[PDB]
């Protein structure tokens, strides 16, 4: 059964010292007792726990900087987040920044854990904090009014008090009931980032999403004008395949396409499912000097290289209103204009590079054209 069981990626977000680590431990301990069991520096805490129906892979990060970095890069992948808010502080600057980051990076669900309720015996105070959380969530397009808010005490639950452990079970209940099963890679529209191209035209790469089948139509998206072709075959390790599946490195014979019609950065895709774009809004983290990043701020007019899947594409940037420069270590909303179009949807990751050096990482937030 545990083999057939769905896997869900979750994580604790929220202001420093609000109880994310304590809650992460209270979740593992209560569920264990109740049911049983690139050049960027990634600082994380990974734990796994189970409910009768689901398997959860849970990420917790030490500092705010780790959340920014981990959420943007995709190291802290979340199908749903648990926003931890201490009743004693109420929402704080990182509570807001974590919700905003969650929106930009595409965290699709947020459940709230109103923490340190053992410290606050005031119903008016608790409703005031819930009110502020829901307004902050709605502000960032999350359904604030319909979001589950569990009132609890991660510490008292971690200390063994059953009345408070009952709140951890309530939170787990919402992980189960509120976060839907994530859409599997194999069920998403076919997508293959092109690595190598050969004449025999065979295009190779890892099938990122869906399935490619002999006889089906495919689109060559990115760089130049979109080309449609039919798949004439799929090969892997010299053995002919009937179809190519997500996660596999395969080769695809394309009918009537000549080697010169294929460029680097192009993708193979199910017709009409991905479009090329030169302009987009993104959330970007710029590496600190201590992470082997830039030493000085950059200004508008900075023309770095944007690495999308297989190739670098030159681009120009637009900074937010009232933002003159970007310091190493900063994370900002960046509007990018590339020289050649790239096939992209929201949630697409890229590296920002200067030569053969990663100076930043980003995620496409909004595709513009």
């Amino acid at each position: 059964f545990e083999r057939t069981k769905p896997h869900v990626n979750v994580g604790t977000i929220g202001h420093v010292d609000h109880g994310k680590t304590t809650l992460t431990a209270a979740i593992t301990t209560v569920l264990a007792k109740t049911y049983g069991g690139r050049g960027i520096t990634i600082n994380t805490s990974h734990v796994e726990y189970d409910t009768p129906t689901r398997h959860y892979a849970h990420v917790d990060c030490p500092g705010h900087a780790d959340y920014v970095k981990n959420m943007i890069t995709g190291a802290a992948q979340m199908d749903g987040a648990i926003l931890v808010v201490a009743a004693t502080d109420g929402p704080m600057p990182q509570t807001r920044e974590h919700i905003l980051l969650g929106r930009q990076v595409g965290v699709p669900y947020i459940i709230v854990f109103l923490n340190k309720c053992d410290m606050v015996d005031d119903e008016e105070l608790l409703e005031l904090v819930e009110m502020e959380v829901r307004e902050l969530l709605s502000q960032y397009d999350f359904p604030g009014d319909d979001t589950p808010i569990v009132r609890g005490s991660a510490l008292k639950a971690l200390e063994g008090d059953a009345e408070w452990e009952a709140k951890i079970l309530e939170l787990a209940g919402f992980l189960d009931s509120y976060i839907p099963e994530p859409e599997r890679a194999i069920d998403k529209p076919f997508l293959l980032p092109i690595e190598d191209v050969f004449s025999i035209t065979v295009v190779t790469g890892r099938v990122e999403r869906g399935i490619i089948k002999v006889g089906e139509e495919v689109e060559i998206v990115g760089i130049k004008e979109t080309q449609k072709s039919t798949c004439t075959g799929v090969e892997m390790f010299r053995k002919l395949l009937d179809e190519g599946r997500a996660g596999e490195n395969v080769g695809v014979l394309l009918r009537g396409i000549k080697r010169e019609e294929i460029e680097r950065g192009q993708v193979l895709a199910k017709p009409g499912t991905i479009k090329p774009h030169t302009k987009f809004e993104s959330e970007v983290y710029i590496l600190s000097k201590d992470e082997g990043g830039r030493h000085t701020p950059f200004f508008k007019g900075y023309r770095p290289q944007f690495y999308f899947r297989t190739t670098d594409v030159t681009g120009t940037i637009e900074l937010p209103e009232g933002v003159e420069m970007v310091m190493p270590g900063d994370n900002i909303k960046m509007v990018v204009t590339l020289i050649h179009p790239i096939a992209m949807d929201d949630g697409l990751r890229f590296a920002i590079r200067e030569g053969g050096r990663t100076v930043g990482a980003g995620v496409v937030a909004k595709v513009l054209g």
């Binding site: 025999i200 190779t204 004439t232 490195n249």
Partner: peptide, 12 residues
């Protein structure tokens, strides 16, 4: 194609 144990390659 062209591969055989773990890298990009192909045929068709």
């Amino acid at each position: 194609s062209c591969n055989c144990v773990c890298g990009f390659c192909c045929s068709x």
